[PDB]
Amino acid sequence: AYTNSFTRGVYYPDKVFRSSVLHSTQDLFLPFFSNVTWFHAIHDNPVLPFNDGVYFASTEKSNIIRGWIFGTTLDSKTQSLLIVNNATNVVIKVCEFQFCNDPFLGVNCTFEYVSFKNLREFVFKNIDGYFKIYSKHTPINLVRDLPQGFSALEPLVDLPIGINITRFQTLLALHAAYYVGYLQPRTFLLKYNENGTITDAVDCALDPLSE
């Protein structure tokens, strides 16, 4: 399935506070009104490409989406990133795993680390050696789809893990719905409001009025 992403997937591009300014930035962002591929927690866990970087989201009611996997081939020939959320812990690992043929969550290594009415949104990207995660949690008024309104994601972590990621997957809990979109290099104009909330943005390559 496919659906329209609207103005979602903007995020704070650097660790610098700004306010009362319209700031031009060129970076990997989700293009406005782009097609996002759409999937369900019932029956639906295919492996997707990663390309330049992945916007990911899920519409939720009881915390069924609980992790992700990233790599080339997921088959112990090389490092693969694993991410899981479990109660008071958020957990990150990059050993040369072999996973299940059908992964789910039952209710030569280099690094390890530890920290519908819900919408959870994320951006996953790479910068040479470095993997970054950004996120937002919000209420939503309706089950239907991604909101036709604006909100900016904020950085969780940076991982110095250096993996050649070309594919990814997500993990479901078993005793919701989720989305995939691809970033592109876009010049953006970001509206940092009087408090430094990014309240709006223009995707400059969208249409002649945005240019």
Binding site: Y12, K15, V16, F17, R18, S19, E154, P155, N195, G196
Partner: peptide, 14 residues
């Protein structure tokens, strides 16, 4: 009064 978000280290002028 500059309400920095938890990840922000600096702020800048134009």
């Amino acid at each position: 009064n500059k309400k920095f978000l938890p990840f922000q280290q600096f702020g800048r002028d134009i």
